[PDB]
Write a protein that binds this ligand. Sequence first.
Ligand SMILES: N[C@@H](CCCCNC(=O)CCCC[C@@H]1SC[C@@H]2NC(=O)N[C@@H]21)C(=O)O
Ligand SMILES: N[C@@H](CCCCNC(=O)CCCC[C@@H]1SC[C@@H]2NC(=O)N[C@@H]21)C(=O)O
Ligand SMILES: N[C@@H](CCCCNC(=O)CCCC[C@@H]1SC[C@@H]2NC(=O)N[C@@H]21)C(=O)O
Ligand SMILES: [Cl-]
Ligand SMILES: [Cl-]
Ligand SMILES: [Cl-]
Ligand SMILES: [Mg+2]
Ligand SMILES: [Mg+2]
Ligand SMILES: [Mg+2]
Ligand SMILES: [Zn+2]
Ligand SMILES: [Zn+2]
Ligand SMILES: [Zn+2]
Lengths: 593, 593, 596
Amino acid sequence: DRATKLLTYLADVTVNGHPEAKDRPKPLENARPVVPYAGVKDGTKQLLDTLGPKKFGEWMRNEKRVLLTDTTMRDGHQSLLATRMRTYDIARIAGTYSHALPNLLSLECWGGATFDVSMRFLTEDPWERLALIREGAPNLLLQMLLRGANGVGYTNYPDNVVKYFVRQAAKGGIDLFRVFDCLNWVENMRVSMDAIAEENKLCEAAICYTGDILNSARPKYDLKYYTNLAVELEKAGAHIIAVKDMAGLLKPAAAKVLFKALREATGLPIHFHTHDTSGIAAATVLAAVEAGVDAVDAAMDALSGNTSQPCLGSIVEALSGSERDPGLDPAWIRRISFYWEAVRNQYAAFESDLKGPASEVYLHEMPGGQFTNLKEQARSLGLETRWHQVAQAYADANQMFGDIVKVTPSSKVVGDMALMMVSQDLTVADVVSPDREVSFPESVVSMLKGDLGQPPSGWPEALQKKALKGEKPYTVRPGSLLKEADLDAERKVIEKKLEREVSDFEFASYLMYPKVFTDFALASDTYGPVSVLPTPAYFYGLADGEELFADIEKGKTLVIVNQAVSATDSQGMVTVFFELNGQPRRIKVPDRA
Amino acid sequence: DRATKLLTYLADVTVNGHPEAKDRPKPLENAARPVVPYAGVKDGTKQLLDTLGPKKFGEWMRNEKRVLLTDTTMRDGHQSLLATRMRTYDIARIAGTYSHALPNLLSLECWGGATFDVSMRFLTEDPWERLALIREGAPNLLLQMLLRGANGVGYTNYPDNVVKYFVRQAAKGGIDLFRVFDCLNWVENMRVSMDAIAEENKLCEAAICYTGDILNSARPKYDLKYYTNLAVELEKAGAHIIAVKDMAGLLKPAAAKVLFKALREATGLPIHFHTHDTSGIAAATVLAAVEAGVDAVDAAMDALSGNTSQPCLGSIVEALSGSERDPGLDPAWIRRISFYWEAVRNQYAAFESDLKGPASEVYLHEMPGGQFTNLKEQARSLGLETRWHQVAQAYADANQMFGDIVKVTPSSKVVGDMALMMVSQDLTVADVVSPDREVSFPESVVSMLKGDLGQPPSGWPEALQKKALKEKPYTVRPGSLLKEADLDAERKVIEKKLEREVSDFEFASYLMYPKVFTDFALASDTYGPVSVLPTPAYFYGLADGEELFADIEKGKTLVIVNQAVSATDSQGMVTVFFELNGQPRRIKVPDRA
Amino acid sequence: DRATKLLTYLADVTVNGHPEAKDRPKPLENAARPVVPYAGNGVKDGTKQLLDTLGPKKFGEWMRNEKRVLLTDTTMRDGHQSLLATRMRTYDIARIAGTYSHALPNLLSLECWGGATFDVSMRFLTEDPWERLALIREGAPNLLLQMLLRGANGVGYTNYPDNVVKYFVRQAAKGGIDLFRVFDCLNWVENMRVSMDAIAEENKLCEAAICYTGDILNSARPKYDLKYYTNLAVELEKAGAHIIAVKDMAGLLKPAAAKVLFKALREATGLPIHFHTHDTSGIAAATVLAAVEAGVDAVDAAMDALSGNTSQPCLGSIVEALSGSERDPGLDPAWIRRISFYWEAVRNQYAAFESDLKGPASEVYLHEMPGGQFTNLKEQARSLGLETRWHQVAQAYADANQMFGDIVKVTPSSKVVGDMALMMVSQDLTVADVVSPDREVSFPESVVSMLKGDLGQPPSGWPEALQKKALKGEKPYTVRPGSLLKEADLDAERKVIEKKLEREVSDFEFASYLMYPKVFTDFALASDTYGPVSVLPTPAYFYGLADGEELFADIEKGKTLVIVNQAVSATDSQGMVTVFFELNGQPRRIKVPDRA
Ligand SMILES: N[C@@H](CCCCNC(=O)CCCC[C@@H]1SC[C@@H]2NC(=O)N[C@@H]21)C(=O)O
Ligand SMILES: N[C@@H](CCCCNC(=O)CCCC[C@@H]1SC[C@@H]2NC(=O)N[C@@H]21)C(=O)O
Ligand SMILES: N[C@@H](CCCCNC(=O)CCCC[C@@H]1SC[C@@H]2NC(=O)N[C@@H]21)C(=O)O
Ligand SMILES: [Cl-]
Ligand SMILES: [Cl-]
Ligand SMILES: [Cl-]
Ligand SMILES: [Mg+2]
Ligand SMILES: [Mg+2]
Ligand SMILES: [Mg+2]
Ligand SMILES: [Zn+2]
Ligand SMILES: [Zn+2]
Ligand SMILES: [Zn+2]
């Protein structure tokens, strides 16, 4: 029966294709990824277990070598492939990291858009993904990106929901939480931060970088701004401070000044995250290293550059033989990169048309992980030919909102405003004007009400009046207004709707994404453990006479040969003929054409 | 096991088409399956012959006032319009209906002619099986064959003991009435077949082939006396019936008034008239013959009548209805059987010629009806489609060059070969017989001029014979020269080549057509009793998801559904997925493309 | 401008195809064009000079006394009407007339006009039936030209005022018709007189036809017996006929009946007898030869290439059967064959319009469908989705006949039994249903019309009960339809068509408007747009010109245009396509719409 359900998925996708891939570019008809051939050395996970998060932070600070986080399994494909990377390809390589690169600080492999996209577009459970990475890499810290009060969502959730999710995240295998607020509002971070400390995990509290500290004509986001936030985050209980440069705006000279001041303002270790949209982010990471930074993020070469992180292999190689040499074997970095390259070839459907570095990024400030999603939304609205006016709008809308930190979900709001402006030919002067009528997007109404928080100088008065159209704003923390969710009764609703008990993890999914989770859980009961399928089989099914080996449970491999596919019958059904371990099986599926 | 072989055939033809039908016109898709009408049976001419014997039966025919009818639909009808491609399945299934509905019929012409070899070579079916099914369906009617005298059912001369052997088997197989003819109207060559049919106590109906025009005084060679003498000669040779075989449909009404009055005066034997409707007036000649006392006439069912076939049975009967000689056939039943044949005919669209209607051109060329369409294609084969009227002029020229000879299988084919060559190479009667013009004749023209088909009245033309042979000719009977074949030896040969014993019938097939029989036997061993398949299935296999009912045998229907067809694999094989009586079956056949 | 107009036609059909041919089977690709047989001396006087000399009355006497059987060739009319939906073009028909004239000068006549040709020429072939007649008259000045004329219906399907019927006949004679075969669909002699008199006023031959139906040798069907026919022959003589025809439209006359019928007709009247039949049965030649044996004066046949099945039986083979006999027609068989080969090559161009008829059918003695309707009714059936139940329709046609009183079925009465049969199958009605009290039925317009009396009267009248139910309160009439019709105002209606066309018209065109106002109007506007497309050879008319194809078009007697299709543009932003022609060496560009 589990095997029968799988055959049903393979039939369906063989006959009808997959909605996300069928109408997009295909992989070359030509070679599956090969896991390189190799107990594992204890690493940062064991140390953290030994020391506890606070002392583990001190250890990082005192460590001379720069510490490396690999982002390939989350930000890398979030930024380059619409986050469509699958568990099968991610989990299959964890053991290789574990054996080959046991010195790594952490694998960023969770949170961001992965939680949402796994269930919705990939038909898979993010919690199972985490558990398979945990088992494959028992010696490395597993790191997630946590959106503070938004969790893994796009809306501010109630305090008890936020706390419940963090508890399950830590139970599921998360050792290191990078937590941020999209307005750098420390008050909105305290609930998350406290909950991370209560699970006795690493709270790496992030400060989002924007502007240019070395440009005295933008004083709002100056050095003092960052050094103060660092100090405040320490008082709030951070184990580590992160600079999250989501748009890749930090320049080398600025890094040199920033990381020095930061390490003088707080004793906590500093972790630096950036994107390579400019084509020079590697120079910034290196400058940060020269200036004492304790840890940096990079992506494997094959999923690096442009809107992703800068090249991990080339950064390591730049540091090779130096005092701060991170002690990672370049031959193994290459082998792993060659794996990800062959992996990436399978996701041709989701490539963007980004051709290289663009200094334009310093003008628009679009986050790396948003840039391509937003280019799609603009195509969607017939704007493809006017992309450069969109980027100009985004920068204009930013100034109109008071010049703000733009990261998920504040970035999406500027996005929605920018798109509207271009579509309807509206200038800043018109959007605010009293004599021009404007129906603002639900996201802009929401933010201007105070649903995402408060910037330094509040929100601009006049823009806020016209937007709310009678509504009274609020300036307090959103979670302080929200009602503690009835958890026992919220559980009953989902358990009644699935006609079965659920696990604590599944309930957490439901709290974050009730509709996505529900739809996903009903799909799972139909199609089975489709995450065990190789990626070409998942997206395109099986060719006539093609043989597939799939491991259903740990013990047992299923041998599936697609022998033949019928025409559509009078009742609208197609019959796919299979061999399962040398036994014949027919499976009927609907012709969705 | 016969089932597995049937599935092998159905798969083989579904995947590759039938070679005879693949590249030709297709029946209309909507297509109504032919429907056998709904109805012991009245004793008829079979029981009469069984009571009276052949001589007494001939007397009975003679004394009968009503004109007796032979239906030719089963044989000459489709030989002449559909290149003899009609299948046992469609033929046998209506036999019982003839038996119940038209019990007064003299006979069913259903065997001999081109059917014998065409069934095996082109339809993968045994002609003896066909005969026995008609016998079992029509136990009350005479079954009639066409026998080519010394040629048996071949195109060549066979030893006397072989001719004797084949007639014996044909009698065992169910043939009651033997129409026997010689291609030059030479009685000496007819003497053995006639003795063999008498020795087996069946009806010897000795035919005289009609050619020329008795009422034109500028053509004396084929005057009335020629035919009256040949009638008396064939009576002295022991005929029970005399036939006038007007192979090319050259007999005109006025000539019929004279010929048949004179014939019945010359002999006490009954007379049987066979013609073809190429001129579009042969029904007039038939009606004139009736009005002049002829005892029996041939017609074909409406739906397979006209043009190069026999004239319309239904309309003839209808013209006689109520007259002194009315044949006592129910017109409503002729109509119903004709509606059956119409639907059957539609299945054989692949084999329809382009013949538009009547042609008085027939009086010039004298091509037999049953050859006309064969030769038009043979000329198409040699790229002559565009000069068909020159080929027709060449056939008439050749005829005169050979001395104004009787044209019919196989002498007709000889003249055909000569005409085709003459046109190909732009050659006249003057060129073909010129002293200084080096030709290379067909292997059939030499053969004829040698003496292999026998002797015409005046012999062969001296000059045209020398240039053709180069080799002394013989004037004697061909069978007097052919050594008596060792039957016990030739039977051990075929039984070794097939590694199994054969029936007496099968050995007679071998004697007539060693190559075609050998190939058919082998194909039968591979594909099974394919003759039980309905005609669409036999020529085109099964549509995707199509359900066939086949009666592998009288006590057993099989239910066969084509559920799917695989792609061609790396061995070049194709797998067809059947459901046979509810059970999955997998048949591999080569991709012949 | 005439040339420019032709180019316009050629561009249009090249780009868009012809509506009649586009989606139908295509002729073979290579195709030898029809070759007109070479003749070079004058033409022997024939029946045309005889009628001019004697007048019709003395001509009929000459026919009667003439020992040899006389022949009418119907290939130019009934032949293709029956086999090719009457789609045969003037170009192919006129080109052989001269050959008939030089090579078969003993023919009684050429049946070359009337029937469906008048209508179809204009509507489906964009040509003028008068131009056709005139071109045939020019090419065969020694043979009688013969038409089928439908009596009260002219060359139409409706009934017309007397003065219009007369006016048409007058133009037909001016246009070149010598021999009018005139018939009434119910054999109602009263309905023929106006026609018969018009023909006599024009001093042409009036061949009054008796349509044959049933079986005179079947006493279980007395209504249509021997004397029914001999009495009509007598009344037609009294009414001024020069010749009596037996018009066996369905090919139902059998050989033994012909033997009795023609011996009797010759005894009953002093007029010559002329026999027309069809070969649907596959034995009509036998009936023709029986009629000759029994003394008939003339018979109709079709050239071999267009003979058989629903057409006439085979001219060449019939002539061959008579060769050397007492009544030998004196027609060279070799020339019959050469002319048949020409028609064969002609016919290959019309593959689009071939029916799927396989051969003879004794079924014809059941349904009694006319030969020149059989195929047309078979399309109607297909149209209504009834291809698969054709034999049901045929059974219903025979059922509908007996319900109507067992009538004569021929244009336009046959058209009405068709419509009734077609309705009966669709809606699964028996005869008992159609005449039922408690079953409401919406009859065809044509059937309401017939039972009212717009087609005239059969001998025993219409069935009372069935007429009540069909009319639904409408009072019927039994008088001659034309006696109730207001005399058309010919001066005023001439002004109407001349106003609509913004030009004066000819007497002939006017006669066409009177018969078919709508069709003629449409054809006259089409001609103003497209010019004299009748002069194009047939492949070019139906399929235009292939890429790079050179065509020689005889735009008139003197003058030949050389036309090459050099290129065809894509469809432009206004939905137009430009065809680049060379015309006599000069570049020309014609824009036509993309009709896709
Ligand atoms: N368009 C949706 C996203 C849905 C895409 C993937 N669908 C699922 O995960 C549901 C599971 C069942 C769908 C399978 S996939 C291929 C086979 N082919 C089909 O068309 N359906 C089945 C969104 O925007 O939310
Ligand atoms: N080309 C041959 C005529 C042979 C045609 C029919 N063949 C036989 O009777 C032999 C056995 C059947 C072969 C089957 S038929 C359909 C399936 N499709 C194929 O292409 N071969 C197999 C001649 O000229 O003699
Ligand atoms: N469908 C009409 C019959 C009309 C058929 C012939 N058409 C005409 O006679 C109109 C004159 C010009 C039309 C030409 S033909 C080819 C070119 N292609 C076209 O589609 N139109 C022009 C009916 O049933 O009444
Ligand atoms: Cl959701
Ligand atoms: Cl052989
Ligand atoms: Cl009209
Ligand atoms: Mg350090
Ligand atoms: Mg007798
Ligand atoms: Mg006479
Ligand atoms: Zn990032
Ligand atoms: Zn024959
Ligand atoms: Zn007619």
